[PDB]
Amino acid sequence: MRALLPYLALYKRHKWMLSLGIVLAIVTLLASIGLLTLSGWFLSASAVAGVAGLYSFNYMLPAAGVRGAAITRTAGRYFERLVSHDATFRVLQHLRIYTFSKLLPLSPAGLARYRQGELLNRVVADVDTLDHLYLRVISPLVGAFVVIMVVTIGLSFLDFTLAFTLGGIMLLTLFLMPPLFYRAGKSTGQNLTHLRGQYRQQLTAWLQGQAELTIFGASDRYRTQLENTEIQWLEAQRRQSELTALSQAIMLLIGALAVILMLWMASGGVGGNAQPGALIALFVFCALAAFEALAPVTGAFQHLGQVIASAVRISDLTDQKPEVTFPDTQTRVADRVSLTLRDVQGISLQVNAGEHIAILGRTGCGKSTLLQQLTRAWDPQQGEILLNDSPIASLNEAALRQTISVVPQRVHLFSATLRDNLLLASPGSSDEALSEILRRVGLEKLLEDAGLNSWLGEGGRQLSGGELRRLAIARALLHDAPLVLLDEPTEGLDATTESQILELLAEMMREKTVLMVTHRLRGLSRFQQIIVMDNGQIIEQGTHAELLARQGRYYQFKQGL
Amino acid sequence: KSRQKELTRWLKQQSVISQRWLNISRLLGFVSGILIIAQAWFMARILQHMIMENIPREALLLPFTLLVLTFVLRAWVVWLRERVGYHAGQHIRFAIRRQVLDRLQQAGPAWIQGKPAGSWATLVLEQIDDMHDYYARYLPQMALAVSVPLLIVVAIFPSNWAAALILLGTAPLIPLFMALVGMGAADANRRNFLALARLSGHFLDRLRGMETLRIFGRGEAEIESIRSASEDFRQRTMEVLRLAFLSSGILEFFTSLSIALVAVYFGFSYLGELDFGHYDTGVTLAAGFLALILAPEFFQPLRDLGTFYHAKAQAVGAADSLKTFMETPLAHPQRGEAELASTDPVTIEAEELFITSPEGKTLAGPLNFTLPAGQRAVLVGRSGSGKSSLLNALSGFLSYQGSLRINGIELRDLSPESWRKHLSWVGQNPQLPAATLRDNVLLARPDASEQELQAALDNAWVSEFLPLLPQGVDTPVGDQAARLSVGQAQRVAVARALLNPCSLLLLDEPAASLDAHSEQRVMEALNAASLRQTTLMVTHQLEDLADWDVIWVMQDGRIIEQGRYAELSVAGGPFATLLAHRQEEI
Ligand code: HEB
Ligand SMILES: Nc1ncnc2c1ncn2[C@@H]1O[C@H](COP(=O)(O)OP(=O)(O)O)[C@@H](O)[C@H]1O
Ligand SMILES: [Mg+2]
């Protein structure tokens, strides 16, 4: 329950919309409780008064209470739904903004968790579940508690021993019963999570491995096993309904015990009266209508277990420690950046301004983390990385992100318009200045039919590997940075496209320092100071001709395979 | 012809599976309406005696006893009706999920490959279970919304026809205000649950791309995009919910008016200001409470139908995804009855072959190859040239409209159950679907002798890294074989393919995305096992193909060149271009 404090403190924003959505729930509940209590007394009082007692009965006061309790109940219900749904969308946005703001400064390192694609589908589903805490848990539980107190306090003016035995019954079933039913089905709700995640484990292994099951004749016996997990799973769901059925029968018996007690106890005297008369129905009808507030409480408390389970998962991620700290000093971005390194994983190299380097590693074995720690994904403990005669750790993020434009190995398509996938690099670029770059990088087929408004990514127009690589270079070309980091370009690309992209770099990154890492020997003659390394150690370096003439390791690379 | 009404029309057709369970639940909802009337009549007769006749409570032990039983019987029917409702929804989900898996196993790996396994699990697991509360709680309540209100009026009509007409007067007005705005808002709301699913898919989009937002400085700009997209969704939803929530407000107005009117009519009938509505007999107090205790119970079945709105709203959203899935037409491969006579290496032939995807799209163009018995061919080319489709067709996963003859027998004629017993495939990725590492190797024949299992483990070089595993040959692999790396997971798939002798061996780039040591061990094992039967391999390790006797350089779904490695590496054709592009790797 202490895990929810970071997310109940986000309620300070819109704390009036949230508190209005709970007041309106109480007012609507009290108007319905007071409409049947006033009506029950009116029939009793007017019947004992009779035709003789028509005079001096003063039925205009109840008429203004019948009229008042109906408007506050029909307008309260309409506005309780409006305000509480409006406030649910407002706290969902603030949960989304808070989660993104916390998860971003720890993006590379803090999110290298198992099943990265599945790690983020849980975060989206966990943020959705925190969104339920207000309407599904807080509004019913708080709304029911205040209604029980207002009824008990307001009903104790007539009699104390009758208000405390109806309010006491309602308070016992609000505080005792929701926990007794959450603990009675905590065992059934734990092997129901075990079986749900086991059926998904077996189903994914049955769908992903369908080629290797049909061929080897095991598809039918791995589905019979799958159907047995479902049958076990459908029984744990059955026991979770044998316990929801009981929690609804018992709620009907507690509301039946309050009615029986009010009929019995209040017939022996209300206040000091020997024969209460009309006051008997006031207590009986206040017990019939008062248990409409306690309907959600047993299921509201059950959902609180899932909201807490989500609040500890999100706090596991967002309450981490970022591995990179950015000083807050407003500096200038240089038009020419000379990159220098000194004993960092180590390896040391010099990248003078205006020259194109190429780091040539052995097919992923090196798995160059140089580009990660050069954009400050993690601080380098080995040595120092200097960026234009100033340590890289002393550069403000808004200035570091401007002096380094990296094209990644995994380029992301943001499921938006083709324009929004390129204002990502330079937001202020004009539409015409953005169409020139797209035509200049071989991406002409995109501008065919409403291209700059064409939805990319998830909605449609999925880009091909060669085309999706030309988009990363398009972003780096719009995002003018004096230092460009090419992370394994032209990998998995056909020989026609690879020659077209290496030519794309040489003529458009002409005045920008580049740092290209590859395991391919194509088009390295145009790079001065080629660097060849293995397992994080520089074997040799120099110009393409100088490496060939040296008859070194790079000569062996060009000789056969 | 709105989609909202088409999906609800689909949800009801699935309910005939549990028609017995929905009938029992509809019968118990009628008994609930009878015990509600019995409760109200006993409470009214007790309250009249203690208010009008001033009878002491000790003389009413007969109506109290019958009132307690009416409450105990009410709680028992609620407990029965809540368990019967589950069995209604369980047997519908069990049958729909069986239809989904049948529709998905028949389509085969060709169509399962279209969507990620995470998305298939959403359909089979999350969306099918989203229809439960429609069948378990909504449908049984929409039958209680007409069983009980109509049964209440039948009980108040004999006692007082004016109090029954007050409740019955509101009976047609509630659906009358559903024909004004109910249809308009309900389908508009269905398109707001879609926007809520898109907005949830736009936050996930920004979460999946925080690596790209980090290296461009767009962290603060995408917070404003989340703020604007969220604020956009709320405004358009609150424009519809400003009208959708009129249904709950109006229904809460008629239940207030009816309770008010029953109290005003009876209240002023006792005082003598009214003289109608009673069957020529003085209106009694017990008749007033009967028609007042039953006024909230007239509208309660309707007001609990709004409590279950999300049961319908999230089942219609699940019906949208499942109706289209079961309606998309697919072109399954044509299966037959013919059986291969012999276990000797098969001969492959093709004339104007046209491999086609299930959705009808042609993948590989005209193919005219021929592979004699016992020979080992190679498929080479660029990615997207249709060479991974050719091996799918030979396995029976893709339909075709050409000619693909196995030992002279057409592949459509061959029975898939018996054809694939002469077929071994190693494949691009391991995909170990069993529990342990021993149960993956023994997938082909689980009853293999302990000596024969060691033959496959040693040949595939699985036993060289077995001691590195915590439990050895019985080491579990978990989900996606994460216990062991892809280099040594592929060697498990090799041991599985070499377990039993086959007739045609398919190798779809077995040593791609493998480490240096594992690739060496895999090749040496698949270069020794490719000589034992008819082999056809897709590869890009073009420097090692000197031994293989036939090479098919395939581009754009067409075999554009043929010959051995000796006469292709110097021919200067499309293979020399491919070989040169490979020689630049290191
Ligand atoms: C379509 C759009 C929409 C949306 C989006 C939504 C979203 C939402 N929601 Fe909702 N609702 C609605 C529409 C809606 N909605 C409606 C219409 C209603 C009505 C109901 C009645 O009738 O009353 C409700 C109702 C409702 C309720 C109540 C129920 C009862 O009564 O019990 C609740 C609780 C809720 C929650 C919620 C949430 C949490 C959310 C987040 C996710 N909701
Ligand atoms: N099930 C499928 N449905 C639709 N298109 C497919 C399917 N399987 C493959 N393709 C497409 O067919 C083309 C050629 O076949 P593919 O197997 O991809 O060849 P390769 O293995 O050489 O890449 C590619 O565009 C591929 O994406
Ligand atoms: Mg392929």
Question: Which amino acid is residue A17, in one-letter code?
Answer: M
* Ligand nearest to the Cα of B392, by number: 2
How wide is the angle at C-alpha B138 spanned by C-alphas B136 and B141, nearest 5°?
100
Taking the C-alpha atoms of residue B131 and residue A383, their distance in angstroms, rounded to an integer, is: 59
CATH class of A339-558: alpha beta
Taking the C-alpha atoms of residue B473 and residue B64, their distance in angstroms, rounded to an integer, is: 72
Closest alpha carbon to A97 in B462, B199, B115, B580: B199
Closest alpha carbon to A467 in A428, A425, A434, A504: A504
Residues 416-435, chain A, touching B (beta carbon < 8 A): 424-425, 427
Q: What is the CA radius of gyration of chain B?
A: 36
Domains within chain B, CATH numbers bracketed = 3-326 (1.20.1560.10), 348-584 (3.40.50.300)
Q: What is the DSSP letter of B465?
A: T
Closest alpha carbon to A178 in A328, A303, A361, A337: A303
CB B340 within 8 A of CB B409: yes
SS (H, E, C) A355-395: CEEEEECCCCCCCCCHHHHHCCCCCCCCCEEEECCCEHHHC
The alpha carbon of B383 and the centre of ligand 3 are apart by a number of angstroms equal to 7
Tokens of B172: 């047609």
Query: Does residue B379 line the site of ligand 2, with CB under 6 A?
Result: no
Tokens 């389970």 found at:
A309
**Where are the domains positioned within chain A?**
4-319, 339-558
Long-range contacts of B12-21, Cβ-Cβ distance < 8 Å, separation of 24 or more: B14/B92, B14/B95, B14/B96, B14/B131, B14/B135, B15/B88, B15/B92, B15/B135, B15/B139, B17/B91, B17/B92, B17/B95, B18/B87, B18/B88, B18/B89, B18/B90, B18/B91, B18/B92, B18/B135, B21/B84, B21/B85, B21/B87, B21/B88, B21/B91
The alpha carbon of B157 and the centre of ligand 3 are apart by a number of angstroms equal to 76
Q: Report the DSSP beta bridge partners of residue B370.
A: B349
Say whether B473 sits in a helix, a strand or coil.
helix
Q: How many helices (H) and strands (E) does chain A have?
A: 19, 9
Tokens of A118: 């599945």
A521 and chain B: CB distance < 8 Å anywhere? yes
Residues across chain B:
586
Q: How many helices (H) and strands (E) does chain B have?
A: 24, 13
Which residues of chain B neighbour A38 with C-beta distances below 8 Å?
A: 263
Closest alpha carbon to A239 in B89, B83, B22: B83
Q: Which residues contact B131 (CB under 8 A, 6 or more apart)?
A: B11, B14, B89, B92, B93, B96, B315, B318, B319
Tokens of B328: 């998309």
Q: How far apart, in Å, do the first and last CA atoms of chain B sit?
A: 62
Q: Which residues contact A316 (CB under 8 A, 6 or more apart)?
A: none
Interface test with A, best of B98, B132, B192, B256 (most A CBs within 10 A): B256
- In this structure, how many other beta carbons lie within 10 angstroms of the beta carbon of residue A374? 21
Pairing of strands B404-406, B348-350: antiparallel
Which residues of chain B neighbour A278 with C-beta distances below 8 Å?
A: 51
- In this structure, how many other beta carbons lie within 10 angstroms of the beta carbon of residue B186? 21
CB A96 within 8 A of CB A273: no
Taking the C-alpha atoms of residue B348 and residue B377, their distance in angstroms, rounded to an integer, is: 11
Question: Which amino acid is residue B405, in one-letter code?
Answer: R
Taking the C-alpha atoms of residue A406 and residue A515, their distance in angstroms, rounded to an integer, is: 9
Tokens of B223: 């917070």
CB A459 within 8 A of CB A410: no
Closest alpha carbon to B457 in B508, B521, B517, B531: B521
Distances (CA, A) of A501 to A8, A436, A466, A519, B381: 52, 17, 9, 16, 20
Question: Which amino acid is residue B44, in one-letter code?
Answer: A
Given resolution (angstroms): 3.1
Q: Report the DSSP beta bridge partners of residue A485.
A: A406, A515
- In this structure, how many other beta carbons lie within 10 angstroms of the beta carbon of residue A350? 13
Burial annotation B468-484 (CB, 10 A radius, 16+ → b, else e): ebeeebebebebbbebb
A216 and chain B: CB distance < 8 Å anywhere? yes
CB A304 within 8 A of CB A201: no
> Considering only alpha carbons, which residue of chain B is nearest residue A92?
B230
Closest alpha carbon to B376 in B542, B176, B528: B528
Pairing of strands B558-563, B550-555: antiparallel
Closest alpha carbon to B307 in A301, A77, A91, A130: A77
Tokens 């009290």 found at:
A30
- Matching CATH topology for A4-319 and A339-558? no
Tokens of A51: 């035709």
Q: Which residues contact A432 (CB under 8 A, 6 or more apart)?
A: none
Say whether A427 sits in a helix, a strand or coil.
coil
The closest CB to that of B245, out of A81, A123, A404, belongs to A81
The secondary structure of A174-193 as a DSSP string is HHTHHHHHHHHTTTTTTHHH
- Rounded to a whole number, what is the distance in Å from the CA of A517 to chain B's nearest CA? 13
CB B389 within 8 A of CB B572: no
Displacement of CA B189 from its chain's centroid (Å): 22
Tokens 């595939």 found at:
B460
Query: Does residue B248 line the site of ligand 1, with CB under 6 A?
Result: yes
Question: Which amino acid is residue A12, in one-letter code?
Answer: K
Taking the C-alpha atoms of residue B262 and residue B162, their distance in angstroms, rounded to an integer, is: 9
Q: Report the DSSP beta bridge partners of residue A503.
A: none
Say whether B561 sits in a helix, a strand or coil.
strand
Strand order from edge to edge, sheet including A356-360: A404-407, A483-487, A513-518, A356-360, A530-533, A538-542
Taking the C-alpha atoms of residue A8 and residue A4, their distance in angstroms, rounded to an integer, is: 6
Query: Does residue B363 line the site of ligand 2, with CB under 6 A?
Result: yes
Distances (CA, A) of B308 to A336, B26, B134: 64, 17, 8
User: Which residues is chain B interrupted after (C–N above 2.5 Å)?
Assistant: none
Burial annotation A471-507 (CB, 10 A radius, 16+ → b, else e): bbbbbbbbbebbbbbbbbbbbebbbebbebbbebbee
Task: Count how many Cα atoms sit within 13 Å of the Cα of residue B390 in the half-sphere of its side chain.
Answer: 36
- In this structure, how many other beta carbons lie within 10 angstroms of the beta carbon of residue B297? 19
Taking the C-alpha atoms of residue B124 and residue A171, their distance in angstroms, rounded to an integer, is: 42
> Mutate which of B243, B300, B310 to test ligand 1's pocket (most atoms within 8 Å of Cβ)?
B310
Question: Which amino acid is residue B494, in one-letter code?
Answer: V
- The H-or-E segment that residue B423 falls in is strand B423-425
Alpha helices by DSSP H, A463-529: 465-478, 495-508
Tokens of A229: 């997990």
> Mutate which of B332, B363, B382, B387 to test ligand 2's pocket (most atoms within 8 Å of Cβ)?
B363
Residues 11-70, chain A, touching B (beta carbon < 8 A): 28, 31-32, 35-36, 38-40, 42-44, 46-51, 53-54, 57, 59, 62-63, 66-67, 69-70
> Considering only alpha carbons, which residue of chain A is nearest residue B224?
A97
Q: 3-state SS of chain B: helix, strand, coil percent to 5?
A: 60, 10, 30
Taking the C-alpha atoms of residue A222 and residue B514, their distance in angstroms, rounded to an integer, is: 28
Has B371 been labeled as part of a binding site? yes
How wide is the angle at C-alpha B88 spanned by C-alphas B86 and B91, nearest 5°?
100
Q: What is the DSSP letter of B583?
A: H
Has A286 been labeled as part of a binding site? no
> Considering only alpha carbons, which residue of chain A is nearest residue B87?
A238
CB A330 within 8 A of CB A170: no
φ, ψ dihedrals at B563, nearest 5°: 135, 175
- The H-or-E segment that residue B405 falls in is strand B404-406
Query: Does residue B387 line the site of ligand 2, with CB under 6 A?
Result: yes
Q: In this structure, is the dihedral angle defined by the CA atoms of residues B451, B456, B461 and B467, taken in order, positive or negative? A: negative
Which residues of chain B neighbour A47 with C-beta distances below 8 Å?
A: 51-52, 270, 285, 288
- In this structure, how many other beta carbons lie within 10 angstroms of the beta carbon of residue A50? 13
Burial annotation A226-244 (CB, 10 A radius, 16+ → b, else e): beebbeebbebbeeebeeb
Taking the C-alpha atoms of residue B195 and residue B192, their distance in angstroms, rounded to an integer, is: 5
* Ligand nearest to the Cα of B507, by number: 3
Taking the C-alpha atoms of residue A469 and residue A466, their distance in angstroms, rounded to an integer, is: 5
Task: Count how many Cα atoms sit within 13 Å of the Cα of residue A458 in the half-sphere of its side chain.
Answer: 17
Closest alpha carbon to A415 in B121, B298, B199: B199
φ, ψ dihedrals at A358, nearest 5°: -140, 115
Q: Do A365 and B516 touch (CB under 8 A)?
A: yes
CB B496 within 8 A of CB B437: no
Pairing of strands B504-508, B362-364: unpaired
Tokens 């890289």 found at:
A392
Taking the C-alpha atoms of residue A411 and residue B32, their distance in angstroms, rounded to an integer, is: 61
Long-range contacts of B296-299, Cβ-Cβ distance < 8 Å, separation of 24 or more: B296/A36, B296/A288, B296/A289, B296/B255, B296/B259, B297/B36, B297/B40, B297/B148, B297/B152, B298/B148, B298/B149, B298/B152, B298/B153, B298/B167, B298/B255, B298/B258, B299/B149, B299/B251, B299/B254, B299/B255, B299/B258
φ, ψ dihedrals at B477, nearest 5°: -105, -20
- In this structure, how many other beta carbons lie within 10 angstroms of the beta carbon of residue B541? 17
- The H-or-E segment that residue B203 falls in is helix B182-208
Q: Which residues contact B466 (CB under 8 A, 6 or more apart)?
A: B457, B472, B473
Burial annotation A109-138 (CB, 10 A radius, 16+ → b, else e): ebbeeeeeeeebebbbebbbbbbbbbbbbb
How wide is the angle at C-alpha A347 spanned by C-alphas A341 and A348, nearest 5°?
35
- Rounded to a whole number, what is the distance in Å from the CA of B67 to chain A's nearest CA? 8
Query: Does residue B540 line the site of ligand 2, with CB under 6 A?
Result: no
Query: Does residue A132 line the site of ligand 1, with CB under 6 A?
Result: yes
Closest alpha carbon to B412 in B335, B337, B356: B335
CB A414 within 8 A of CB A421: yes
A352: left (phi over 0), alpha (psi -120 to 50) or beta: beta
User: Which residues is chain A interrupted after (C–N above 2.5 Å)?
Assistant: 345
Taking the C-alpha atoms of residue A418 and residue B197, their distance in angstroms, rounded to an integer, is: 22
A4-319 CATH pick, 1.10.1740.10, 1.20.1560.10, 3.40.50.300, 3.40.1390.20: 1.20.1560.10
Burial class (CB in 10 A: 0-12, 13-18, 19+), B574: middle
CB A333 within 8 A of CB A515: no
Say whether B447 sits in a helix, a strand or coil.
coil
CB A33 within 8 A of CB A337: no
Instruction: Give the dihedral of Cα atoms A48, A50, A53, A59; nearest 10 deg.
Output: 80
The alpha carbon of B192 and the centre of ligand 1 are apart by a number of angstroms equal to 11
Query: Does residue B194 line the site of ligand 1, with CB under 6 A?
Result: no
Q: How far apart, in Å, do the first and last CA atoms of chain A sit?
A: 63
φ, ψ dihedrals at A409, nearest 5°: -70, -45
